[model samples]
Target: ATSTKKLHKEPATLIKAIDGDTVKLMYKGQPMTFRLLLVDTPETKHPKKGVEKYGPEASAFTKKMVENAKKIEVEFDKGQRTDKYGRGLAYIYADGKMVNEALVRQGLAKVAYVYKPNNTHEQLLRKSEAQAKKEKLNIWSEDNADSGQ
Candidate 1:
């Protein structure tokens, strides 16, 4: 999306943390599950998918981020509205900081925009993933060396 596609921002109240990248929030006056855009943390839930490495830690991190947030908001991209699971695809902001980017930067999440049409913050996410790898932060540490970026 270009600069003209202004991202609408509004106050959001965190309702639940589904996992590292998935959260239930009150947006536009309705409670919705928002899967953080351009990122995917390790799986923490799924009847058949099973949990993966660092999933618990990632979930904890997201929980803390939201708990500490003075202000929370969700930004919808220019393309798709929601995923097949009915989760809203969006960029989450905590105190004006992009939570999606923060997760990748902290190596708690990986860049995984499965929906090709959504790339509103791809470049920014890529850079954060790279830097996190270079710094060997959290999930990039020797114990969890395996990573996508």
Candidate 2:
């Protein structure tokens, strides 16, 4: 199989961060929903799931980071640009830092949904999560925390 490097680097403006991992953005003059790749933060708005542990903190942190950034960009992976819910799958960059990795490094999110071809930053995210785990941050603070998806 031959692969070509074509990560879709698109400049975007944040409308709002719905939660830690979901955001609405103004992309190409249209509002679009995108889910952060390879990471899942605690759910703040799950109908049946109420609020998860650290959900509020994660939401606040994401909102603060995105809102404070002067430049925001997104890059889609090589495969599966959208999930079953039709939200765009992407890695978000606030300023020059990756928000996904930052969330993981801060223990606000966990590495998840490691599907094929969309694993461009899987190793990096995992590494960040591992470090957070070792440090016993947030979700990793509990001995029986639910592992990644």
Candidate 3:
């Protein structure tokens, strides 16, 4: 096993849930936009990809997760902290349950982004994704379903 850095979770406020994988938050006393790193939900914004299948459901789940959480926290990985879009990249946690993992396990999101040196939870995510695939949940339900556009 390779040694990896252990990062700690910090508190944040879910200011807004833009979509399944994107969100706006109030962190460190300022408004911040972040993407749920390593996960990609179906396209549902700016009419991207012309509204991919299951997009609404994906966003819905993401919204509810944060909306009902008494505690909204984030954990930054060990490598690069932001993407080219200047968005903070981290794993979101709602009351102790990781929204990222839940999304994959429910087949609402796919483990897509994997830039190196920042995969603190890569193995766990891949495992959850595999379980969803094996169960043929949503995105994996039909052949050539296209995880997203």
Candidate 4:
């Protein structure tokens, strides 16, 4: 097992964004990938899981915020690594900003998963998500004009 400090030095490069939460990376000579921890944005392909209530607006928002950025920082506790699908699980930070928290704060993502022992950001993510929910921003908006629907 490698130490977090050593992994921290690996320096992640965002090669391609799989979605709002999943990104492909090239790290330490390997094709390391990561899934943003603690949040889940509505699927762009799910019929029932409509796009944000704002639909295209939200999709555009996410694309503008995350596409083609380099050097994302990752934080890990005990279970910080990839999942069974080979995607790294991490608390992502980009440009000194916490990506997971930012998504929730922007009402673009929600704290939908809580993995024990590594849920340090649960409360913060949930709080941001609730704020977005209360405002009915994006997916939570009353318009329900999701592209998925």
Give the winner by lDDT: 2
Across 1-149, the per-residue lDDT of candidate 3 in tens digits comes to: 15545875678998888888988988898999989888888666646554546857877787888999898889998887778888998889997988899899889889887888888788999889999999888888888545555
Better structure of 3 and 4 per TM-score: 3
lDDT of 1 at 24: 91
Candidate ordering by lDDT (highest first) = 2, 3, 1, 4
Please write out the lDDT profile of model 1 over residues 20-116, one tens digit for every residue.
Answer: 9888989878898888888877666745535545656787788889989998888878777787898888788998899988888788888885566
Ordering by TM-score: 3, 2, 1, 4
Give model 1's clash tally: 0
Q: By lDDT, is 1 or 4 better?
A: 1
TM-scores, one per candidate: 0.83, 0.86, 0.87, 0.74
* Candidate 3, pairs of clashing residues: none
Candidate 2 residues 13-109, lDDT tens each?
Answer: 9998878888898788889998888998865674655555674788788888999999889998999878899898988999889999888878888
Give the alpha-carbon lDDT of every model.
0.80, 0.84, 0.84, 0.66
Clashing pairs in 4: 53-138, 53-139
3 versus 4: better lDDT goes to: 3
**51-107, model 4: which lDDT tens digit per residue?**
444334434544555564455667764665767787777776767777787777777
Prediction 1 TM-score vs. true: 0.83
